[PDB]
Each structure stands twice: as structure tokens, then as C-alpha cells.
From a paper:
Typically, the oxidative folding machinery includes a soluble thioredoxin-fold protein, DsbA, and an integral membrane protein partner, DsbB. The disulfide form of DsbA is highly oxidizing and donates its disulfide bond to unfolded substrate proteins, leaving DsbA in the inactive reduced form. The inner membrane protein DsbB, in concert with its cofactor ubiquinone, interacts with reduced DsbA to oxidize the active site cysteines and convert DsbA to its functionally competent disulfide form. We determined the high resolution crystal structure of reduced KpDsbA and the NMR solution structure of oxidized KpDsbA, and we measured the redox properties of this enzyme.
Author numbering: 0 to 187
The structure:
Amino acid sequence: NAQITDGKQYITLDKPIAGEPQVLEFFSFYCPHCYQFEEVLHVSDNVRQKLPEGTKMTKYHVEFLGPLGKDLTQAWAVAIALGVEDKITAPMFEAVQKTQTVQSVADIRKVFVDAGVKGEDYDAAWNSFVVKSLVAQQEKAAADLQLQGVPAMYVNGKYQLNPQGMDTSNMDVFVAQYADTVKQLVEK
């Protein structure tokens, strides 16, 4: 059956925020731990797979890491606005961290284009009011929730996941524990 505990597998915010997405992840394409999180452990997908139906997995990008943090945050806004997150996430992590072929803003676009995204759509999205507000929203969320680092996950703007208090002696275990903790938090 299982049961989680405040202070252990999660922590409760002293200043919860209303109106946030139910399951909100922060990440950076630059961060090695975010790479492991997303591309090796596939934490988020495991979480999403245990999520009570009707509940969506939301991910925001952060600007405070790396030389292109701001522009990658805007590119992620485009990915959201175009609905191409699933086509882009793996290529970008590889291009940024592994092949290290993302050195400029133009190189970001190439990842989208190479991934199947029409350049005309990318360009339209990039300069849209829509994307401009998505950027603002990503920035605002991290501030409101008092983000200290990535990766990070918050549930109902009230609980923060705390992997340090999980069992990290085995990764298959840890992932299952992370997924279940989120599930329990959303049913709460």
C-alpha cells in the first residue's frame, strides 16, 4: 500500500502558491542531473505513467544556467506553443550536453528543424506574444515557488519533491519511489 511523510520524500512550502499546474517540473538542458533525470532515468515519464488520469505533466525551463539559458527558455516556450515538446527534448539534451553543438541561438533552431519542425512555424512562434508570456510565466513560477536549483518538481504549488529523502541506493527503486510519491501527493 505504502505511505509518504512530510520532511522525508517531499517537503511542504511555507508559502504555497495557488493556480499552478498540478505537477510542475523545472529543468535545464544544460544540467547533467537533468540529463540523467530525463534521458537516463526517465523520471518524468515514469511519474506521468502513474499519474491519476486528467492530471498532466508540466515542465518549465530555467535561465540561470549556461550561456544560452534565456534563449533556451524562449525556445522551450516555442516548443510548448507549437506542441512539439516530445520531438525536441531528447535531441536538445544530446545537442547541448553530448555533441555540444549548441553554441548559438541559431543552433537551437537547427535542433527543432532537424527534428521535424518547420522553420516558418518556429520563427512565427519565437516572435509571438504567446511565447513572450510563456517565458514570463516560466520565470514567474520559479520565483514564486522559490526555486533553488534544478531538477525540481512541485505538486499543486504546495509540495516540493525531496529525492534526498528517498532511497538512492538503487535507481530502479528510486525512480519508482519518486513516481509513487508524486501520485500520493496529487491524490492529497
